[PDB]
């Protein structure tokens, strides 16, 4: 509830910075994931660096209830109870021969039930592979090469990574016997021919206006388990750019969508998509106030090391999502549109993305 909203709202704001910077390119992101690893980060920071993170996220991780809330949240989401195909990894790596604050590790581990890993970034390629293998093996082998070539070097002292793979199955899946190349109309007027799925069913649907007055469709594709949903949304009119919608998104608005949904017999035309995005969190986080964490001597990580100056050399998220098959009105998404994977009991925005070109 409370912390699920803070986390989601925060993550949706990060998504927006990412979106406003790749205005015409495919993006998949995880609001929840970036909130999770920046909450971890809070434990390692101090002074103004810590205050920046806290002012942007809306809560302090060491307040009572805060951390236990987040763990209960994690167990609510990643519950093999749901037979869920979410695989997730968070991880902070720090240079090996720096004296860590006594008492930090046991504390970090009690709160998050994971640990900060120590490696030697002086073996540049060996350390890149240790981190990559760690991410790969902890995402069911789905997320490879998170750290690209030259992403780390001898001076690298602290690296933050977040990786997610999601392959849910729609409660009511699209029948393959109904997929066909259709004209998809891109943000720059030019069109292209992509395969679009289609299905006539009793879909949850509603429509909203932007603060500007532009109309848009929202539709909810529930997943097996009755717990997660994908929402698909796009301005009805093609001359209105998807950004008019992305710019007004929030975790609350998304809750209102769900709240207004009604079950209506509809024809849905929806392009298949396979997205894999690596997002460099630096610029987006910087745009939200968190600037110090990236500056060599101004960054305060004195909760992690009281003696040696640390700064974040890389903060990276890599996400992968595959959306495939497993007198009604028509909703045709032959334009750029948004998607959101939502955990409805808590209101957590797990995934969010835009398809500008499938």
Alpha-carbon dihedral of residues 25, 26, 28, 34, nearest 10 degrees?
Answer: -10
Smaller CB separation from Cl ion, 222 or 241 = 241
If the CB atoms of residues 104 and 208 are measured against Cl ion, the closer one turns out to be: 208
Which one of the spans 58-66, 265-273, 300-308, 332-340 is the region binding Cl ion (CB under 5 A)?
332-340
Rounded Cα distance between 326 and 263, Å, is 21
Q: How far is the CB of 235 from Cl ion (least distance, A)?
A: 8
Which stretch in 1-9, 30-38, 136-144, 185-193 sits in contact with Cl ion by CB under 5 A?
Answer: 185-193
Neighbours of 116 (CB within 10 A): 19
Q: Are 323 and 28 in contact (CB under 8 A)?
A: no
Residue 180's CB is within 10 A of a number of other CB atoms, namely 9
203/273 with CB nearer Cl ion: 273
Question: Would you say 117 or 186 has its CB closer to Cl ion?
Answer: 186
Stretch that binds Cl ion, among 4-12, 65-73, 151-159, 183-191 (CB under 5 A): 183-191
To Cl ion, the closest distance from the beta carbon of 150 in angstroms equals: 34
Q: Taking CB under 5 A as the rule, which mask of x and - marks residues 93-112 in contact with Cl ion?
A: --------------------
Residue 241 binding Cl ion, by CB under 5 A:
yes
Q: Which is nearer to Cl ion, 189 or 259 (CB)?
A: 189
Give the contact letters, 56-85, x = binds to Cl ion (CB under 5 A), - = no.
Answer: ------------------------------
- Cβ pair 206, 218 in contact under 8 A: yes
Nearer to Cl ion, 93 or 337 (CB): 337
Choose the stretch contacting Cl ion; rule: CB under 5 A; options: 69-77, 142-150, 253-261, 328-336. 328-336
CB of 328 within 8 A of CB of 57? no
**CB-neighbour burial class of residue 35 (10 A; exposed 0-12, middle 13-18, buried 19+):** buried
343/18 Cα distance (integer angstroms): 22
Of 271 and 336, the one with the shorter C-beta distance to Cl ion is 336
Which of these ranges, 107-115, 127-135, 237-245, 345-353, lies near Cl ion under the rule CB under 5 A? 237-245
Q: How far apart are CA 287 and CA 280, in angstroms?
A: 13
Tell me the C-alpha to C-alpha distance, in Å, between residue 170 and each of 21, 78, 173, 220, 259.
31, 18, 5, 10, 20
Rounded Cα gap, residues 313 and 266, in angstroms: 49
For residue 84, give both structure tokens: 């869920």
Among 11, 33, 168, 336, binds Cl ion (CB under 5 A): 336
- Residue 5 or 335 with smaller CB distance to Cl ion: 335
Among 145, 167, 179, 187, binds Cl ion (CB under 5 A): 187
DSSP annotation of 310: -
Assigned token pair, 203: 């879909």
* CA distances, 351 to each of 195, 286, 343, 357 (Å): 23, 21, 10, 18
The nearest distance, CB 186 to Cl ion, in angstroms, is 8
Q: Pick the stretch among 28-36, 153-161, 236-244, 318-326 that binds Cl ion (CB under 5 A).
A: 236-244
235 in contact with Cl ion (CB under 5 A): no
- 145-165 burial by CB neighbour count: b if 16+ within 10 A, else e? ebbeeebbeeebbbbbbbbbb
Using the minimum distance from each CB to Cl ion, give the nearer residue, 124 or 244. Answer: 244
Stretch that binds Cl ion, among 140-148, 215-223, 238-246, 314-322 (CB under 5 A): 238-246
Out of 53, 242, 279, 341, point to the residue binding Cl ion (CB under 5 A). Answer: 242
User: Considering CB under 5 A, how many residues would be counted as binding Cl ion?
Assistant: 4
Binding site for Cl ion (CB under 5 A): 187, 241-242, 336
């Amino acid at each position: 509830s409370y912390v699920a909203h803070l986390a989601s709202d925060f993550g949706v704001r990060v998504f927006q910075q990412v979106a406003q910077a790749s205005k015409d390119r495919n993006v998949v992101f995880s609001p929840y994931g970036v909130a999770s690893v920046l909450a971890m980060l809070q434990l390692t920071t101090g002074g103004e660096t810590q205050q920046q993170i806290q002012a942007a996220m809306g809560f302090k991780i060491d307040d009572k209830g805060m951390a236990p809330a987040l763990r209960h949240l994690y167990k609510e989401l990643m519950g093999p109870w749901n037979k869920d195909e979410i695989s997730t990894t968070d991880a902070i790596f720090v240079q090996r021969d720096l004296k860590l604050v006594q008492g930090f590790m046991p504390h970090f581990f009690r709160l998050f039930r994971s640990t900060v890993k120590q490696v030697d970034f002086s073996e540049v390629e060996r350390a890149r592979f240790i981190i990559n293998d760690w991410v790969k093996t902890h995402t069911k082998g789905m997320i490879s090469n998170l750290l690209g070539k030259g992403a780390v070097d001898q001076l690298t002292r602290l690296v933050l990574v977040n990786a997610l793979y999601f392959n849910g199955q729609f409660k009511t899946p699209f029948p393959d016997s109904s997929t066909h190349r259709r004209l998809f109309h891109k943000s720059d007027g030019s069109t292209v021919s992509v395969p679009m799925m289609a299905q006539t069913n009793k879909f949850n649907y509603t429509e909203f206006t932007t603060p500007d007055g532009h109309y848009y469709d929202i539709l909810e594709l529930p997943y097996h388990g009755d717990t997660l949903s994908m929402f698909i949304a796009a301005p009805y009119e093609k001359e209105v750019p998807l950004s008019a919608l992305t710019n007004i998104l929030s975790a609350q608005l998304i809750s209102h969508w769900k709240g207004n949904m009604t079950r209506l017999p509809r024809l849905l035309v929806l392009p298949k998509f396979s997205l894999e995005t690596e997002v460099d969190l630096r610029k987006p986080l910087e745009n939200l106030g968190m600037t110090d964490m990236f500056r060599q001597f101004q960054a305060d990580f004195t909760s992690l090391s009281d003696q040696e100056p640390l700064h974040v050399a890389q903060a990276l998220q890599k996400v992968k999502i595959e959306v495939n098959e497993s007198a009604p009105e028509e909703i045709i998404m032959d334009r750029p549109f948004l998607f959101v994977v939502r955990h409805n009991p808590t209101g957590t925005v797990l995934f969010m993305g835009q398809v500008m070109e499938p």
